[PDB]
Design a protein around this ligand. Structure first.
Ligand SMILES: [Mg+2]
Lengths: 68, 68
């Protein structure tokens, strides 16, 4: 979502989540989880080498396994 | 790739996208997608943007037909 500051992009994402909850989306997205990831949280506490890559890889593997 | 090569690529990849989008993609659609993406889209390169145009058109028509 591209736009000027304060136009409602985060509101667009929240509205998509609300549409998922209210179930007005196609069948392919009926029971999908919209999970908001902050990269500062992912990079937190990552002093040693390979820790950030490990965390991101585990996140991606979990996404692939869940599939929703 | 050139325009003719891009059309050949789209015709080769048509079966996968028809299977995913549950629709039928016409040859005139392939030609129009290649021509319009080459003429109007400027920041991207022929095969990728032609594929994107075909895929998004298929998604839009699928969403319009499915919604009820
Ligand atoms: Mg925001």
């Amino acid at each position: 979502l591209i736009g000027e500051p304060g136009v409602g992009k985060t509101a667009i994402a929240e509205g998509l989540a609300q549409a998922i909850v209210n179930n007005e989306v196609p069948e392919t997205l009926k029971d999908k989880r919209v999970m908001s990831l902050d990269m500062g949280t992912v990079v937190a506490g990552t002093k040693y080498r390979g820790e950030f890559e490990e965390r991101l890889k585990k996140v991606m593997e979990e996404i692939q396994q869940a599939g929703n | 790739p050139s325009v003719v090569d891009t059309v050949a690529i789209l015709k080769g990849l048509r079966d996968r996208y028809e299977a995913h989008h549950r629709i039928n993609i016409s040859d005139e659609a392939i030609e129009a997608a290649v021509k319009l993406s080459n003429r109007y889209v400027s920041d991207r390169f022929l095969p990728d943007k032609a594929i994107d145009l075909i895929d998004e058109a298929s998604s839009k028509v699928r969403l319009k037909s499915h919604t009820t």
